[PDB]
């Protein structure tokens with residue numbers, strides 16, 4: 071699949087707002103994921119112990135990882151589809167080291183959409199949400215292809 075320049079513009083416009091507070095968005099999204107799909111938390115031996123949302127919000131380590139993963143996604147989105155280089159190491163670690171199923175990538179995609187819709191309604195109308203979904207679908211499609219080449223079901 072291929073996004074038009076207009077669709078990329080909608081994605082990068084709302085992303086520019088996200089970048090005003092990388093740590094906040096990074097954390098909010100992970101917490102949303104963990105609350106909606108508790109099984110995903112079990113994949114993080116580093117955060118598995120956290121029992122409540124309050125404990126998650128107070129975790130300095132969770133906030134730091136929020137910055138790490140969200141910045142990596144931003145780097146990929148800014149490539150506007152030319153992300154082969156960025157995808158390689160990410161696919162290898164998540165398939166071979168962390169063992170993250172494609173299903174969980176769909177779960178975090180839903181969490182991203184939920185948080186952007188809550189925090190940026192003015193810049194995340196139907197057309198903008200559609201473009202972001204398309205961008206995340208492209209990412210998941212390419213990641214799935216890499217998983218297969220690397221020997222992981224997904």
Ligand code: HEM
Pocket residue numbers: 110111113114115116135138139140142143159160163164168170174175178
């Ligand atoms: C938008 C998709 C995602 C991006 C861009 C992303 C990015 C990253 C990055 C950059 C790292 C650190 C370097 C590395 O190990 O590769 C990381 C680590 C990790 N990711 Fe992801 N990730 C994504 C989705 C997920 C999902 C959905 C899960 C699990 C539900 C997951 C679980 C992990 C785990 C367990 C680590 C190790 C954390 C630690 O112990 O330090 N990731 N991810």
